[PDB]
């Protein structure tokens, strides 16, 4: 059972379909309309449903042409208000009827950010975008907002007719909108089921460029030609990803590059991946985001954890698919680096959190607990972990494949738990059943803290990140001099960051250490997102008040969470910029995401 959703469970009811008409209201910060449910019953003699709802005003309910009587309970915190719905005539079991729902969401809606024009690159129109994520799209609308179920979709939305809207389907044509000549009417069509945190809109001044057979690239016009180039990989991974995962069965493969404020690098939302434009290197080195949401077309949408408390499935799948696609593209040795960095980040994590938190165990329980506070690296990374051990024992990379790409068959179109995956694993490798047994599947599911067992990483590409850093490390001021622009000259941008990462593991250094870094690798002129977060927080953690504005800035001019969270609560435990970092919160909570907003705020221990 789902105990982060109080609808109905799949074992009750479950819904097959939603027709959305609604329409985007940027005056009123509200999308208003109708969301009919095609529901079908699981059981006999059914008389009401309960559906999730958050912050949602409801006009009626009609179902058969006629109103019908519904109540909306208490609110539960996060979770929102359960709203139960007294169905005019009994269902018998398999039966299917559809239900009308007149809503309006609020303007705090926490799956949505509306923005000024202010805060576009264009200046000149609004925008909006949704995350919903685990469990926000109950702020958008009233559903069974659980991953247990999957549906279709169809929707029709209202904009403004000089914007575009897009959502997670295929587009099915636009028309001005017969109520509202100064609207258009952009339609929509997702005929896979899909969980409904995968639904998704964004309505702004929106332009396109292809750049594959099956992709355009979305954003506002001043970012469509740097995007293009950054994600120009997209089709040659999306080869890789069909090789290893089965045939892509969702149509097309579109991404669009959100403001700023998108909380998340990327999120995997069928037909059109949501990504950040602080991917925007100019040398596509932060491509792995692209990976990782192309794989999530196999491993989430296509095969999806049946509960939040299972979210390792789909991220620890994804990840070990995501290192294979970047395997393939640039070499097994690669694969081993960016393995090795994951679990760099998951000792950073645990360390985090403390090694007997739970929120560090891969099974999580997620009873009273808000995801989006429980949200960590650990399923992923130590999800990878488990399978790269797997992998390891069970024979190397190409017998596990196999198994990746019989699982995503064998479970397609449905929601599955852990217990489920390991049944499925001891069935495939039936052979190496002893093989299995040695791994102790209490500690790796289920205790806190890291694994118990490595696994095994070619260090060919780590060493020089290694050296350099326990170099850096070990130096007293007499070696100071002996640092020298040329030191960097053998390292990718890849390897950079690592040596960033691993230094940053033993932060703080010297201050005196600090400046001469900066006054022999000029750090402060790198814009790579992933170097310059971990250069300022190395600068911030070691107290040098120079950084504190640089810091201050990146915070604030973008909102990727990865690297918003962690420099406001850097800023906020040094002294000199603790002030400054609470009351540059203050100042742009409201103009912030909501989720975003909240999270920092709870971080900082503001409000
Ligand atoms: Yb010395
Ligand atoms: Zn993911």
């Known amino acids: 059972v789902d105990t982060c959703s109080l609808a109905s469970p799949a074992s009750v009811c479950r819904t097959k379909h939603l027709h959305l008409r609604c329409?985007?209201?940027?005056?009123?910060?509200?999308?208003?309309?109708?969301?009919?449910?095609?529901?079908?019953?699981?059981?006999?003699?059914?008389?009401?449903?309960?559906?999730?709802?958050?912050?949602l005003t409801?006009?009626?309910?009609?179902?058969?042409?006629?109103?019908?009587?519904?109540?909306?309970?208490?609110?539960?915190?996060?979770?929102?208000?359960?709203?139960?719905?007294?169905?005019?005539?009994?269902?018998?079991?398999?039966?299917?009827?559809?239900?009308?729902?007149?809503?309006?969401?609020?303007?705090?809606?926490?799956?949505?950010?509306?923005?000024?024009?202010?805060?576009?690159?264009?200046?000149?129109?609004?925008?909006?975008?949704?995350?919903?994520?685990?469990?926000?799209?109950?702020?958008?609308?009233?559903?069974?907002?659980?991953?247990?179920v999957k549906l279709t979709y169809t929707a029709?939305?209202?904009?403004?007719?000089?914007?575009?809207?897009?959502?997670?389907?295929?587009?099915?044509?636009?028309?001005?909108?017969?109520?509202?000549?100064?609207?258009?009417?952009?339609?929509?069509?997702?005929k896979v089921p899909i969980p409904c945190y995968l639904i998704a809109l964004v309505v702004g001044a929106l332009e396109s460029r292809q750049i594959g057979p099956r992709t355009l690239v979305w954003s506002e016009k001043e970012q469509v030609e740097k995007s293009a180039y950054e994600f120009s990989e997209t089709e040659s991974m999306l080869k890789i990803a069909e090789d290893l995962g089965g045939p892509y069965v969702w149509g097309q493969y579109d991404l669009l590059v959100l403001p700023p404020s998108f909380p998340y690098g990327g999120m995997e939302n069928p037909c059109?991946?949501?990504?950040?434009?602080?991917?925007?290197?100019?040398?596509?080195?932060?491509?792995?985001?692209?990976?990782?949401?192309?794989?999530?077309?196999?491993?989430?949408?296509?095969?999806?954890?049946?509960?939040?408390?299972?979210?390792?499935?789909?991220?620890?799948?994804?990840?070990?698919?995501?290192?294979?696609?970047?395997?393939?593209?640039?070499?097994?040795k690669f694969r081993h680096f960016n393995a090795l960095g994951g679990w760099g980040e998951l000792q950073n994590s645990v360390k985090t959190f403390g090694e007997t938190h739970p929120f560090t165990k891969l099974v999580v329980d997620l009873t009273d607990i808000d995801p989006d506070v429980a949200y960590s690296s650990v399923p992923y990374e130590k999800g990878?972990?488990?399978?790269?051990?797997?992998?390891?024992?069970?024979?190397?990379?190409?017998?596990?494949?196999?198994?990746?790409?019989?699982?995503?068959?064998?479970?397609?179109?449905?929601?599955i738990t852990t217990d489920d995956w390991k049944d499925f694993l001891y069935s495939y490798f039936k052979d190496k059943v002893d093989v299995l047994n040695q791994v102790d599947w209490n500690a790796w599911l289920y205790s806190p803290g890291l694994p118990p067992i490595k696994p095994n990483y070619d260090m060919t590409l780590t060493n020089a990140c290694i050296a350099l850093s326990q170099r850096w490390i070990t130096a007293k001021?007499?070696?100071?001099?002996?640092?020298?622009?040329?030191?960097?000259?053998?390292?990718?941008?890849?390897?950079?960051?690592?040596?960033?990462?691993?230094?940053?593991?033993?932060?703080?250094?010297?201050?005196?250490?600090?400046?001469?870094?900066?006054?022999?690798?000029?750090?402060?002129?790198?814009?790579?997102?992933?170097?310059?977060?971990?250069?300022?927080?190395?600068?911030?953690?070691?107290?040098?008040?120079?950084?504190?504005?640089?810091?201050?800035?990146?915070?604030?001019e973008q909102g990727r969470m990865k690297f918003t969270r962690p420099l406001f609560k850097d800023l906020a435990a040094f002294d000199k910029s603790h002030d400054q970092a609470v009351r540059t919160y203050q100042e742009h909570k409201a103009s912030m995401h909501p989720v975003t907003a909240m999270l920092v705020g709870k971080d900082l221990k503001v409000d």
Not at 387 to 399: K, R, S, T
Not at 479 to 498: C, I, P, R, V
Not at 526 to 554: G, T, V
């Open 58 to 148: 409801i006009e009626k309910v009609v179902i058969n042409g006629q109103e019908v009587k519904y109540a909306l309970g208490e609110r539960q915190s996060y979770k929102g208000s359960p709203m139960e719905i007294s169905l005019p005539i009994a269902l018998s079991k398999n039966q299917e009827i559809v239900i009308e729902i007149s809503f309006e969401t609020s303007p705090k809606s926490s799956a949505l950010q509306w923005l000024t024009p202010e805060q576009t690159s264009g200046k000149e129109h609004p925008y909006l975008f949704s995350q919903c994520q685990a469990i926000h799209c109950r702020a958008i609308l009233p559903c069974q907002d659980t991953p247990s």
């Open 272 to 332: 059109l991946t949501f990504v950040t434009p602080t991917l925007l290197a100019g040398d596509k080195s932060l491509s792995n985001v692209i990976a990782h949401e192309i794989s999530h077309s196999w491993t989430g949408n296509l095969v999806t954890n049946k509960t939040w408390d299972h979210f390792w499935l789909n991220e620890g799948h994804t990840v070990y698919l995501e290192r294979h696609i970047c395997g393939r593209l640039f070499g097994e």
């Open 23 to 55: 329409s985007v209201d940027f005056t009123r910060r509200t999308l208003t309309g109708t969301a009919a449910l095609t529901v079908q019953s699981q059981e006999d003699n059914l008389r009401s449903l309960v559906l999730d709802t958050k912050d």
């Open 384 to 415: 990878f972990a488990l399978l790269f051990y797997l992998e390891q024992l069970l024979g190397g990379p190409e017998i596990f494949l196999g198994f990746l790409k019989a699982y995503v068959e064998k479970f397609s179109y449905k929601s």
């Open 477 to 556: 001021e007499d070696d100071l001099n002996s640092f020298n622009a040329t030191d960097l000259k053998d390292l990718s941008s890849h390897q950079l960051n690592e040596f960033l990462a691993q230094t940053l593991q033993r932060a703080p250094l010297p201050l005196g250490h600090i400046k001469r870094m900066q006054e022999v690798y000029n750090f402060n002129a790198i814009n790579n997102s992933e170097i310059r977060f971990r250069w300022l927080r190395l600068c911030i953690q070691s107290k040098w008040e120079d950084a504190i504005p640089l810091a201050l800035k990146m915070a604030t």
């Open 156 to 190: 029709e939305v209202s904009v403004p007719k000089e914007l575009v809207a897009l959502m997670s389907a295929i587009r099915d044509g636009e028309t001005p909108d017969p109520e509202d000549p100064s609207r258009k009417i952009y339609k929509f069509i997702q």
